[PDB]
């Protein structure tokens, strides 16, 4: 057997997919020696995070690294990753509680562009598994990096709301990803769940996703959220760009829509006025 999500993105296991692409991850710290991602992820010197809330906070590496380690595994993990040949570079913009700032994210996006200009490699994919309120400056920085030729993928947000009220979800040039479950339905998360609406480009597996756990060097855990869904699309984009490296952003977006499974989501889950605005697409690899 295979994790449900990897079976779902397979049209009805590439061992080195996405090798021409570098995926930048802006997230928490990562456990770079975890067997699932060791050697595949390069930890940059970049760190820009706010102080944790509560004066008695205990900074335990296993807890601090949880979010980012799981997402690095979803993208390129040896056993459970989508694009097993993709190289990753991590930047720390989220603290041990998963909180960051718009300013830290802006400085991180600038660091990525500066790094690219100093030592260019192949096509770049930037994964932003985070969200805040609508931000003019964050949308602008994302638009400028996309216009410079970099592919950006972001989480739609986990607020069961219109993604246009959040950033970078609301930036049109960024590929915005909602989450679906094993029944191909939108993911519920407590009393909230995946965002929806016209700012979402497509959905991808985002519930009970097996990936690297920072509890131990060989541990695995299931996680849910639009971050996990965005990580699937970053992996699929790395695979598509490695197969066709000359694709422009517009062409890549066309490929993602073309190969997605269509009309499998029950639109009744979304609010009435959002059904015609939300794309009924679940991401999948090309055959």
């Amino acid at each position: 057997s295979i994790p449900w999500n990897l079976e779902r993105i397979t049209p009805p296991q590439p061992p080195d997919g996405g090798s021409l692409v570098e995926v930048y991850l802006l997230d928490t710290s990562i456990q770079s020696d975890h067997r699932e991602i060791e050697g595949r992820v390069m930890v940059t010197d970049f760190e820009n995070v706010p102080e944790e809330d509560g004066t008695r906070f205990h900074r335990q590496a296993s807890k601090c690294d949880s979010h980012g380690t799981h997402l690095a595994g979803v993208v390129s993990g040896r056993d459970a990753g989508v694009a097993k040949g993709a190289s990753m570079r991590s930047l720390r913009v989220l603290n041990c509680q998963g909180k960051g700032t718009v300013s830290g994210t802006l400085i991180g996006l600038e660091f990525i562009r500066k790094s690219q200009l100093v030592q260019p490699v192949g096509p770049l994919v930037v994964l932003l598994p985070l969200a805040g309120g609508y931000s003019r400056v964050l949308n602008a920085a994302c638009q400028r990096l996309a216009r410079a030729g970099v592919v950006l993928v972001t989480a739609a947000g986990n607020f069961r709301d219109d993604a246009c009220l959040y950033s970078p979800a609301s930036a049109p040039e960024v590929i915005t990803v909602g989450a679906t479950n094993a029944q191909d339905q939108p993911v519920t998360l407590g009393t909230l769940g995946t965002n929806f609406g016209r700012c979402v480009d497509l959905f991808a597996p985002g519930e009970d996703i097996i990936g690297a756990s920072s509890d131990c060097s060989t541990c695995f855990v299931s996680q849910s959220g639009t971050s996990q869904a965005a990580a699937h699309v970053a992996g699929i984009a790395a695979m598509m760009l490695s197969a066709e490296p000359e694709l422009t952003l517009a062409e890549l977006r066309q490929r993602l829509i073309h190969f997605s499974a269509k009309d499998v989501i029950n639109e009744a889950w979304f609010p009435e006025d959002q059904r015609v605005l939300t794309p009924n697409l679940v991401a999948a690899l090309p055959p």
Binding site: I2, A80, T218, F220, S222
Partner: peptide, 10 residues
């Protein structure tokens, strides 16, 4: 899938 394992479950 849901769970936690000390090795790759599949």
């Amino acid at each position: 899938c849901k769970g936690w394992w000390d090795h790759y479950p599949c």
